[PDB]
């Protein structure tokens, strides 16, 4: 009842100007079918066309909501409509796809990659797709992409459609007040959409009733602050597939905007996207375009669009005014949609490169960060890479760990006592059985009991855990008097001389196998680290089986123990193939970082039969 009481509508009551056809009025409807103010004299009244649409036919059955709103309504009430009535959360990102209204076909793998990226980026950020609504041209390709999404994957992409009300087929089929109306499958509305913002200017069978309202709604949502509350709004991409003359001026309006909206076009579809491609590669320094490529652009505009010399001249002038902001324009030339919106979010945030690195950490995209954030010519603040190092471990971003090691970060200068302590008390990442282990060793050391929830698990308690898990006459470097003295006097002396050993231990205690395999390659005493990791993983497997925990944890810990044992065996094979005597000295030299032990003793204590 709130939708009719808040949102208005307008209906064609005019003097019926015939113009060309006597039946066709200024609004194009039939002359006897009646019942802006200029020549249409339209009147305002509450709506009676809203509710739910049940898409009958066309593959999967999808219920898509709808409402008919006047074209001159303020976007604030519409934003309140999406946030309250249909129960849609505020997005992290907006999508705005435009294109040609005519139907077309593209390359098949171009369509497939376009569709797969347009689905996948919409899942990973939870963005809202803004289309042209009706099932024509590019929006039909969004519908096919969403059909493949319904056939293969499990998300519910909010894929908001904005179309004129006058052009949709079976207008009487969608008349009701909060009533589910069946719809069969002027042009048909797209079947695989989620909600509809069908806008009526009074006219029927005419476009232009939706562009200004969609533009104002995109501006109004772009002024809304994102939930990070750092001082930025949500970013907006401008997606172009092919298009015509109007999308050139849409691109110009998006570039000449405060704040600027970056636009990415694609290649292979043809027409306007191809002439942006031909302008973009053949550009030199932005607007400095030479004499051969200007008339090449003019003849391709006059050939592909079939316009005159002067019409091509104004389109080239608008193209040059668009290009003058070159840096927001990027082209996906064949040989995707994901990279477009990820780049657009990076330059719509317009923040520093630590913020870009943290956002790529959030999206788990190592290739995007490598191609864009870590390109040549990127300035870096002092100490921001170390914070990104910490944020990339608390989360299992081994690939981002590999990237950051390859781009200048050293483990010797980063790992401190306090940083490894904060690594040991993280709450992110996968689950682990470490809390049960420290609870058991504090119960054994001080017979108390259950640890407090706000407990800072000290490295001395970690060392006691390595004591209970190793067994025998082991004595870890944490529990020795030197480390306890330094811990009492502090809570390059606090830096670890051998940090990858501690990274091994923290990766083993918390069941992060991929970082353990990465940290086995980097650093030294790989045989000792592999045998210690094998004994540790076997002992946490036995401890997890002893304390009636989940058996899958015990099976995966046994698998990790067998992987580390196989690594130790194959390392022994390589050492035997290279040099026998140096392999003997590898097998017998005393391990100062592992309680003065021997690799042979560690293999026997791990019960490793193949070694």
């Amino acid at each position: 009842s709130w939708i009719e009481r808040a949102f208005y509508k307008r209906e064609c009551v005019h003097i019926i100007p015939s113009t060309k056809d006597p039946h066709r009025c200024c609004c194009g409807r039939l002359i006897g079918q009646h019942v802006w103010s200029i020549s249409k004299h339209t009147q305002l009244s509450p709506t009676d066309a809203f509710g739910t649409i049940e898409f009958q036919g066309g593959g999967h059955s999808n219920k898509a909501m709808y409402v008919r709103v006047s074209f001159d309504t303020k976007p604030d009430l519409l934003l309140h409509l999406m946030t309250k009535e249909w129960q849609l959360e505020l997005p992290k990102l907006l999508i705005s796809v435009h294109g040609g209204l005519q139907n077309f076909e593209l390359q098949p793998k171009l369509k497939q990659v376009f569709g797969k990226g347009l689905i996948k980026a919409a899942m990973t950020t939870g963005a809202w797709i803004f289309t042209g609504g009706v099932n024509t041209g590019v929006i039909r390709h969004v519908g096919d992409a969403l059909k493949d999404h319904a056939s293969k994957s499990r998300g519910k992409i909010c894929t908001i459609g904005i179309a004129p009300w006058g052009i949709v087929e079976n207008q009487e089929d969608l008349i009701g007040r909060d009533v589910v109306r069946p719809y069969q499958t002027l042009t048909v509305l797209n079947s695989m959409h989620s909600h509809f913002i069908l806008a009526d200017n009074g006219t029927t069978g005419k476009y232009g009733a939706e562009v200004k309202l969609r533009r104002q709604l995109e501006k109004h949502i772009s002024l809304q602050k994102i939930n990070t509350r750092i001082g930025q709004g949500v970013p907006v991409v401008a997606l172009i597939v092919e298009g015509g003359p109007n999308v050139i001026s849409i691109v110009l309006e998006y570039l000449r905007d405060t704040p600027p909206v970056p636009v990415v076009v694609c290649d292979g579809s043809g027409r306007a996207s191809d002439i942006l491609a031909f302008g973009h590669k053949y550009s030199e320094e932005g607007g400095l375009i030479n004499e051969s490529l200007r008339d090449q652009l003019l003849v391709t505009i006059q050939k592909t669009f079939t316009y005159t010399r002067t019409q091509a001249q104004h389109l080239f002038i608008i193209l040059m005014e668009c290009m003058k902001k070159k840096e927001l324009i990027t082209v996906f030339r064949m040989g995707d949609i994901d990279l477009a919106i990820l780049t657009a979010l990076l330059k719509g945030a317009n923040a520093s490169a630590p913020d870009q690195l943290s956002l790529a950490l959030a999206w788990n995209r190592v290739d995007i960060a490598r191609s864009q954030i870590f390109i040549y010519g990127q300035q870096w603040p002092v100490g921001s890479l170390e914070q990104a190092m910490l944020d990339a471990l608390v989360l299992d971003r081994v690939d981002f760990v590999k990237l950051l090691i390859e781009n200048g970060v050293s483990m010797h200068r980063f790992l401190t006592i306090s940083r490894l302590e904060e690594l040991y008390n993280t709450r992110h990442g996968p689950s682990n059985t470490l809390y049960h282990l420290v609870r058991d060793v504090k119960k054994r050391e001080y017979p108390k009991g259950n640890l407090p929830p706000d407990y800072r698990i000290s490295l001395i308690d970690i060392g006691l855990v390595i004591e209970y898990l190793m067994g025998g006459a082991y004595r870890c470097n944490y529990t020795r008097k030197r480390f306890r003295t330094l811990y009492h006097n502090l809570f390059e002396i606090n830096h670890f001389p051998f940090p990858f050993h501690e990274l091994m231990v923290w990766a083993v205690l918390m069941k992060r196998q991929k970082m353990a395999l990465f940290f086995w390659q980097h650093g030294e005493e790989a045989m000792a680290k592999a045998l210690v990791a094998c004994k540790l993983c076997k002992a946490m497997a036995h401890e997890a089986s002893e304390n009636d925990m989940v058996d899958d944890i015990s099976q995966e810990l046994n698998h990790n123990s067998r992987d580390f044992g196989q690594l130790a065996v194959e390392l022994l094979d390589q050492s035997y193939k290279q040099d026998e005597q140096l392999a003997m000295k590898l097998l017998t030299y005393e391990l100062k970082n592992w309680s003065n032990a021997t690799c042979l003793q560690l293999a026997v204590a791990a019960k490793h039969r193949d070694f």
Binding site: S292, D295, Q296, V299, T300, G335
Partner: peptide
């Protein structure tokens, strides 16, 4: 073959420019 496709684009654009000269 990618070297073929890059230089066939240059030859086709040059042929369209020569046809515009005619």
């Amino acid at each position: 073959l990618e070297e073929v496709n890059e230089r066939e684009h240059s030859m086709k654009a040059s042929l369209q420019t020569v046809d515009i000269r005619l």
